[PDB]
Amino acid sequence: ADRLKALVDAAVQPVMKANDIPGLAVAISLKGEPHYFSYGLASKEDGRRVTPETLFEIGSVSKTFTATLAGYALAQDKMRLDDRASQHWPALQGSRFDGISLLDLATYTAGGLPLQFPDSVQKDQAQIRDYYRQWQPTYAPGSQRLYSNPSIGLFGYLAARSLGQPFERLMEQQLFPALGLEQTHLDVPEAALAQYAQGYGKDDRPLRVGPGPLDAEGYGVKTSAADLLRFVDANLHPERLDRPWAQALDATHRGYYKVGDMTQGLGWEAYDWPISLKRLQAGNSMALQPHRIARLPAPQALEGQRLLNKTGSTNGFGAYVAFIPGRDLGLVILANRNYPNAERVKIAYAILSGLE
Ligand SMILES: *[B@@]1([O])OC2=C(C([O])=O)[C]=[C][C]=C2[C][C]1[N]C(=O)[C][C]1[C][C][C]([N][C][C][N])[C][C]1
């Protein structure tokens, strides 16, 4: 307990001072035991302290939840990864999505869908439909990875359509309950708002995420360190869940291609373990520009001596999740500042190394 807190303090405290992080929550799953380390302030203005129940925006860590709902649709044979995208939304039939697979959308290889929807696209069903209807690939589907909200957002929306209900309803009514997540929200209840940390940007501008097209699919989850560790433990032990949910989690542990040291799954990104900190930082700090992929001859099991991870950022928050299946080791780092991905990995690496 002294060694473990000293290890986590040594990793966290300098990174919080260097990046002026007001509050940070750590959760570690070690050999099936949870450990929580809470630092600093959820809100500077009233001095509310971070706890393991504080809600943080996890940004693009939401994509691993989106991938899990798609895994659930696969498990129920409502869809297949080699389906043409437009088979799941009649509004897209006759568009370029006639020639793009669900796997291409899930893995950012549809042919140049951008990082974000253009500002001209509001959170509006018609605007989003018309955006996709008019879109044309810049390059061949299946050839270049460009990290993209509209890409995996559409994957998530099409998975929900395949299940016959809206995305946000499936998450609240089926997925969060199935995984035992009662402190995980797309739309934070009025009664839980007291737990919602403040985000801090430039000059400590207060920042909580506003509405955007396919926000729920791309970046919309708010959760606690305790709940996000529950999600990690479900990923470490899919076999403990009812069969369809065990399968949905397994679908997110399959690699399709490599870019540098990274193997791309559905939501999760994987590295061999051990690997240098510099390489794990570089993987998580990629130039937001297109990368040629190396396609695997068959989908690869993402298990054993590998680190699976995901970064997530909003204007006010910075999240990182990592787990090593072969070591039954999981960690969550949630902060209320969008501090650099390399600094998030720096904390995590110090902890995971400390425990190897
Ligand atoms: B997501 O968090 O992944 C991501 C990272 C990362 O992996 O850490 C870094 C940089 C960008 C992204 C994209 C994802 N996050 C967002 O899209 C943030 C979101 C974008 C829309 C904003 N509101 C628009 C204003 N009308 C809010 C922040």
Residue numbers in the entry: 5 to 360
From the study:
β-Lactams are the most widely prescribed class of antibiotics in the United States, and antipseudomonal cephalosporins (including cefepime) are important therapies (alone or combined with β-lactamase inhibitors) for P. aeruginosa infections.
The active sites of the PDC-3 and PDC-88 structures in complex with taniborbactam revealed strong electron density for the bicyclic boronic acid inhibitor. The boron ring oxygen hydrogen bonded with the side chain of Y150. The cyclohexane ring of taniborbactam made van der Waals interactions with Y221. A minor difference between the taniborbactam binding modes in PDC-3 and PDC-88 was that residue Q120 in the latter hydrogen bonded with the amide oxygen (3.1 Å distance) of taniborbactam, whereas PDC-3 did not (distance is larger in PDC-3 at 3.6 Å). Superimposing the taniborbactam-bound PDC-3 and PDC-88 structures onto their respective apo structures indicated that binding of the inhibitor caused only minor conformational changes. Also, upon binding of taniborbactam, L293 shifted toward the inhibitor to facilitate a 4.8 Å hydrophobic/van der Waals interaction with the bicyclic ring scaffold of taniborbactam.
